[PDB]
């Protein structure tokens, strides 16, 4: 098959979402130093090194442990954690439940709200019958850590780690429950302590990768890119694109339509390592080239630039074909 139909015009002009936050892609964020991503990320061999499927449903784990700090159980933070490698229900990988975010945990306590944490809505439930602990529903920060539960610290490797959920606001009544279940909707938001937007999230040094995840590095003047969408933040839940308190961008490694397609057919015979499958992105004044690697990473010929490329003036996408990564991808505004 030719992977050309994987990146059509609607994918980057309003319909396509990023494979991490499920937000409408509105920009291309180059990463001059490179990055890695495996969760909800597919390559051209039909495989992922991650633990999530190309869909945004619910995060669901049935065997963790829940607790609350302090001497009072009312309006208190609730902590849930489980060992990485215990998502027995997940057929893709037992590392983490399908949909668990690939971001290192940002520690916090008390009134302080974590900065740049993945946050989702849900709570704790009872593993023996499936009944919810109704007094534990809240917004929870989710992430990978070590030293849980005594002192969760951010980690970006999966083996030996722990997955952690902790409410950023006080739950109605906290519970101490062993073999506790976690249920959180897989569509997330970015935690902010106030109304200000922050830098794009997650930053490369916050992404958690499984053993064997290939990295995206520069090849000459070609630089790997992430796909930026406007993601909501807890500090100002109303803010969307062009807000007076700043525009919050979330970033993903692939357009979700590309991930879906890569996960249904095998494209091993379309590319060899050292080649991009190139599309030409045509704008109102000028054009640029997008290149896709066998590892499922996208590149651009922007060199050391980290300025975000706005897509609001993109007109159409035309496939080009395989091209050598020795050639600098064209970039003409």
């Amino acid at each position, epitope marked *: 098959i030719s992977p050309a139909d994987l990146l059509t015009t609607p994918v980057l002009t309003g319909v396509g979402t990023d494979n991490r936050w499920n937000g409408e892609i509105v920009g291309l964020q180059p990463v001059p130093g490179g990055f890695s991503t495996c969760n909800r990320h597919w390559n051209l061999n039909g495989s992922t090194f991650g633990w999530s499927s190309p869909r945004f449903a619910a995060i669901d784990h049935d065997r963790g*442990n829940a607790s609350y700090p302090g001497s009072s159980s009312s309006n208190v933070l609730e902590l849930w954690y489980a060992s990485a490698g215990s998502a027995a229900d997940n057929p893709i990988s037992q590392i983490a439940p399908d949909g668990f975010p690939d971001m290192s945990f940002v520690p916090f306590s008390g009134t302080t709200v974590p900065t740049a944490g993945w946050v989702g809505f849900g709570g704790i439930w009872n593993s023996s019958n499936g009944a919810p602990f109704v007094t534990t529903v809240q917004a929870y920060e989710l992430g990978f850590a070590t030293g849980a539960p005594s002192n969760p610290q951010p980690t970006t490797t999966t083996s*030996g780690a722990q997955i952690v959920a902790k409410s950023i606001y006080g739950v109605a009544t906290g519970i101490n429950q062993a073999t506790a279940g976690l249920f959180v909707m897989a569509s997330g938001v970015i935690s902010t302590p106030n109304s200000s937007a922050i830098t794009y999230t997650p930053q490369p040094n916050r992404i958690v990768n499984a053993p064997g995840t290939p990295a995206a590095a520069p090849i000459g003047k070609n630089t790997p890119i992430m796909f930026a969408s406007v993601v909501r933040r807890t500090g100002d839940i109303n803010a969307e694109a062009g807000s007076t308190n700043g525009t919050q961008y979330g970033a993903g490694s692939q357009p979700l339509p590309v991930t879906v397609g890569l996960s249904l057919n095998n494209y091993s015979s379309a590319l060899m390592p050292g080649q991009f499958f190139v599309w030409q992105l045509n704008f109102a004044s000028g054009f640029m080239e997008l290149g896709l690697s066998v590892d499922g990473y996208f590149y651009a010929g922007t060199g050391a630039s980290a300025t975000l490329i706005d897509l609001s003036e993109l007109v159409d996408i035309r496939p080009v074909g395989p091209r050598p990564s020795t050639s600098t991808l064209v970039y003409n505004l």
Partner: antibody
Amino acid sequence: QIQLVQSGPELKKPGETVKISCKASGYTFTKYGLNWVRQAPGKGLKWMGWIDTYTGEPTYADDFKGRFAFSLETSANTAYLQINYLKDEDMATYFCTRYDYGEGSGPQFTYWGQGTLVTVSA
Amino acid sequence: ELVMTQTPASLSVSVGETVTITCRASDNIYSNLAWYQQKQGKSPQLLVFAATNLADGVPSRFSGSGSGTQYSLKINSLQSEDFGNYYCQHFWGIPWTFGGGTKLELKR
């Protein structure tokens, strides 16, 4: 050398208050949680709780929520346990221990202080 | 909730004997079980973690095994340095609980 050095023995009366020190060295104090375990003379070890050394947030076993309080002084690489309104049932050796879980290790109490014996008598 | 029951309370052994002590949990702890050794007048030292792994620096003669609710600690050919008290402890929901302890005394 990694070590946890605890404060000296205390001898107090019923109802009085005691504060025990546990000072770490040889590692980053705020990256590893400290748990408190107690042992009455001749009996076994009872777990009390942990204090998150990065945030200061303490978690207690339910039996210890009333009169026990964990604190820390980050600048001094030191954790504190304070017991108010001492009972006879508080007479024990108190251990601070460093919690580890990750990178192939744990969950485990890896390093232990030398203990602090609180004698309660009138 | 999970209470720990160690067995036996004490046994008298000679150097060179192989010894098995047992820790049983009141519900499943999913191998989140550590073994500690405490010598008279000292602070405990870590022996096994996650049921079956020797801590850094623990001699090869110590052996941990188990799953679900029944766990055991085996000491092949007890050297003179092995006498003292032994505790199991679970990390499955607070309160984390220690067993009652097995005392290995010297035979004669």
